[PDB]
Amino acid sequence: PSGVEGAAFQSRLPHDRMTSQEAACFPDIISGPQQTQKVFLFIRNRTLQLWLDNPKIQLTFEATLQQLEAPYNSDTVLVHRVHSYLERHGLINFGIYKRIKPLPTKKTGKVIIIGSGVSGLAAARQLQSFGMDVTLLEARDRVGGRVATFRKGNYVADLGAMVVTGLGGNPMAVVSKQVNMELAKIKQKCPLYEANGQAVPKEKDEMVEQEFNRLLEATSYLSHQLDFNVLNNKPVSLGQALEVVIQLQEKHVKDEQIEHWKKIVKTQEELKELLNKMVNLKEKIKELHQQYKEASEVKPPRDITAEFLVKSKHRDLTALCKEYDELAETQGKLEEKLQELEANPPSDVYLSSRDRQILDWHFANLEFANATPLSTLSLKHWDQDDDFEFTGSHLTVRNGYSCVPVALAEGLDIKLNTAVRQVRYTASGCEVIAVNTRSTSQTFIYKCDAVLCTLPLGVLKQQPPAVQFVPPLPEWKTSAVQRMGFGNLNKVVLCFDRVFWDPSVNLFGHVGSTTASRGELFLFWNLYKAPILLALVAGEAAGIMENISDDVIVGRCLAILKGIFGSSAVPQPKETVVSRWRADPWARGSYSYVAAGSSGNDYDLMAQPITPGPSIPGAPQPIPRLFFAGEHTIRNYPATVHGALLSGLREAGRIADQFLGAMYTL
């Protein structure tokens, strides 16, 4: 999409409709005449396009109105209301830009942000941008959270997020322009080696993949068209449903052999009755010959009765010879029909063990995407965020994804090594109690008007709690935390002294031996300048490889590489790194998934703020003080870095609107 309308698409907005968020800000216009709505819609799209076309510099209200044309640059309170809405909810002037109007020295209100992960940083940059006092509290000794980026010498390898899912409507597109990030595309040609290390041929490879995508659609049909979404009270998982579809396809292969052989039998029985006529008729024929001969043995001249017997017998002998010939006519067909069916049988099996083993790798990939074994993924909802896919090749970051978060952290008050242990929020403000991660006895107290919590969902889910809320989070929130899924995947980093793989191939598979180990080192990435190979441990295997030393893991990795490329071309790796996300206490997991029994609705619950009770009973309802942001709060773009970033921008506008006052709704 291109023009002003490309700006609306690139900003995740319908170019020709007012969205629900905009109506709330501008009820006068959306309840008004169709002409006004179009004016507004243009002013919106046109400002977006301006900011987009150059995102390294602030877009001031002046700059905007300058470059509108009449009739649009006529009403200047409409242009001012539009620009201010845009700027507030991070649709323009977000990320890293040069400030035209230096932020005023006197701040307004005070906000503690828990976590300098990407979502934290995003809101923190935006809140400060709005003239607020913003301090971030980070438990780790580095920013970025789940965006990690191993760096030693010339080696660079992220152990957290590493792919940008396509710039078509992606806030990361803007940040990329804003910060140089080496962006490389990903050729999608991936060949899968078998357990024995022999490359799988295209025949199986293309066949299984088509069947895989065919079994997936089958579940989606079980879900939406048969409402098979609940079984003995427990809601149906994707894994469950894939089994009920592989079983029903193995049933069908059998029902198909039965009613084929059952055509043979019926056909053979038809023959049985035909050969019984034919052998009882060759008996009447043999006996009749004994009579016509014997009757012809009465030499002529004979009485007319004796002559009648010879002719009559010779006739029933010609009658029964017509019959027997008509029956070996019918016999011919049946003999040939049998020879057809016997050498024209139907499929003998649904999936060979070698074929299914390949399929189990395709299920590993799917447990990679959602970071959890498929039994857990809600059958109805696991793919509910699929409508909001960006458009474009997926990319990697050659310099490490760590540079984005670090850039965002420029100019922000970040207290590293600071583990929040109690969040305490009351009708009159909040105080956040943190310790120092190195000597934990040393205690810190932070007072503030509002707390924005970007704690990972796995942290929020820890039992016993790793962070205490005072007062407790309400049941509608803690139920949401239980229901929601937070899964796990890990990576292994292999640093060599020479490229010994196919350099024109970014990623190549390894097929597992079992279903149970389908995730265990199932995929490798050449992504980087340097000689670095990346190994992914997904599925049920991720949670179990965390209990195994790095050597044992690097051990298995070499083995599978070895068979795939020979035992004399795979040298010992120089530097090796293994992650352990669900083991990490600041992540307790990789990212969230829609667990069975959860829905997308929970992702919205996570994002509702908490308004505390009144201190003095009889006082009026207070302000919301506790806010949430992060990957598990943005229901339309979860488990991603862009989703995190959008969540951070979202809460910054929501928090600002609360303590700075939205004067763009009049």
């Binding site: 990903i186 997936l216 799917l366 995407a369 959602n370 696991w382 699929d386």
Partner: peptide, 4 residues
Amino acid sequence: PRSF
């Protein structure tokens, strides 16, 4: 939810 379905990658590459």
